[PDB]
Subunit: 178 residues, 4 copies
DNA sequence: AATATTATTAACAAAATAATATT
DNA sequence: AATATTATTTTGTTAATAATATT
DNA sequence: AATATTATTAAAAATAATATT
DNA sequence: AATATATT
DNA sequence: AATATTATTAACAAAATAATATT
DNA sequence: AATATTATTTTGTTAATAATATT
């Protein structure tokens, strides 16, 4: 079993590490998406809709690690700019469904063009281990915790990502294209 | 060299993981600390003050993972409640220095008394790996990325924590007391 | 810099681990191949010849860890039994190259029909960590150390072993065949 | 479940790695001992008996990786050389116990002062990783496999070493002495 | 009753100013 | 040469409820 | 919207009594 | 001899 | 005229469980 | 069981003998 000291020490390490990593990720994500007048949760929302079509607001919240209310308010704002299409189904009218307009695909796609990994801070602070291991780091221990907390459906998102990157995009010149 | 697609795959993966961890950690921090009329960043300041004495507001920003402005305004409020004390020095009258008050140490102590690891969801996510490895996980990769983003001086924090848990607090009655 | 004491600690950990893993693997490998009157090193040489064709005795000894003389002597016996064929070039008549006959390919194929993962104790020894990780362990650390001792040319063997086996073997009735 | 393709990939990877690493450690351990008219398993026995004082032949044939026959024979030879001494006990007479003479304690102490980590090639393989992490590698994955093969009693031979080194030995003059 | 929202109310925490202070 | 460290006062994200329409 | 029963309390055809016819 | 309401 | 290594090929010297008998 | 004798080996060690152009 565990002494109280061991529990306390593990929590303070993992508390400060999560906080540090997330803050650097935040700053960089924001610089990138400050053109186009988008908040971080907004971009998250569109991305989810690309990989999952016809999702529920609540489903959205689950993948997008945000509260359901934040998802509702922001997706309404996204229909105002004309980037998303709401819908409803006859069998049950409680749930509301979300799909992506053509301008949305245009935003996401154009935005992919502008990705420059080098600017991002984590990429650079993780490049040492890439050569040592010949491959980019896979934080299995985080992946284990996070799978336990959030379950096995949540962890589908990663798979879908790699599955979409291959056979829905290609590399030309120095950037990625359809 | 790294192909572009490789960089994008590493980026989305690390992004989703840090968001899921910090969101969980944030929630479980706030619930514990709400009774004392203290926000997350105010608690983080008090903690920095106990482990680093006579710091300057920028230094507690650096350790705290918070901007300079939030440090100042929250440290001011904490002088109002009486938990913290301001100070200044002759070498340079520009810097403002910060120390804890006797109330402050009492507040942090009580917070240690009211600690139940089984409530935090990270802790419970981590136990499965403790059985396999006989000790609580050290996310060496994440620690190494953090050094290259934040520097070695910042990291003194972990060392100081560990040291100052051992000496002043003694385990007794399933509790911690001087 | 390190203390002497820490180095003594690392030596003993790694020297006792290595002895355990090789001793145990040795016992099972011997069992599996004994019906064909074959030494561990001999089966090694046959395998090398499958993956790396037209390879010198120095190459055979490099990839299968062994002295030049062990490789040459044993290979002589394996050309007597008719498993392999000796060939010499028209430039640098010093070098003797090896290839593999249809008899030797027959014995290797037939062995592969007798492979059973559960009798192998190191196989069962891993199943705990395959369940948690979701994939078999990759021991990057050990691989680091081996590569920095033997050089990246040596490690080609692994890659080649991977690709060959995925392309030219399919599973029929639960046993692998061409 | 597991396809037999997966199981073959794992076996071959772990076979090659285990073999390479043990072959390196044999090369260096034999030279460190050869001046003292010793072989590897003999040395291993003297060490065992330093840390586990009263033991049976079967015990030292568990902790040192060897058969019972080898333990009895190599120990007898060491009685002749005068390094070890045999005992027996009334409660159960079939057992035979071993202890270390002062000549044996001497050869072990003499040997300690010929320990030069920079010669041995594994240590040199580990140094990059110590530079990156900040400490020497613990290779947990190997430890789990080995524990799942040899049981927890066997693993005690690690803890005992870590303890003795920290108490009985002392570091001065770039060397380790009582 | 329990399920999916929708519509407000607070509050955390920076982004962007002002101005005192070391040669 | 302007800069460095507060200090003052401007913004926007995001989520914790409270009301509401469907099974 | 879908499921339901326990009650309260309520509101199709024959036959039977009284009324006028 | 005729008629005249409760519960997920 | 000088200057060297390089890759085999032939022989000795070990160890290691494997069966194998006895309080 | 837990020893205490015997038998079968398969990794390695060093000797000897050949093959190449390049300063």
């Amino acid at each position: 079993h565990y002494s109280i000291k061991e529990a306390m020490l593990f929590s303070q390490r993992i508390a400060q590490l999560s906080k540090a990593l997330w803050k650097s990720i935040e700053k960089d994500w924001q610089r990138w998406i400050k053109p186009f007048d988008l908040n971080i949760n907004e971009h998250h929302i569109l991305w989810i809709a690309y990989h999952f079509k016809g999702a529920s607001i609540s489903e959205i919240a689950k993948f997008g690690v945000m509260h359901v209310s934040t998802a509702f308010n922001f997706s309404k704002k996204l229909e105002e700019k004309g980037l998303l299409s709401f819908s409803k189904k006859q069998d049950d009218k409680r749930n509301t469904y979300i799909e992506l307009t053509e301008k949305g695909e245009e935003v996401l796609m154009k935005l992919m063009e502008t990705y420059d990994p080098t600017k991002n801070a984590v990429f650079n602070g993780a490049l040492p281990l890439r050569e040592l291991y010949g491959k980019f780091p896979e934080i299995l221990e985080m992946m284990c915790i996070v799978r336990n907390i959030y379950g096995d459906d949540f962890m589908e998102i990663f798979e879908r990502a790699f599955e979409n990157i291959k056979e829905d995009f290609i590399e030309q010149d120095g950037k990625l294209v359809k």
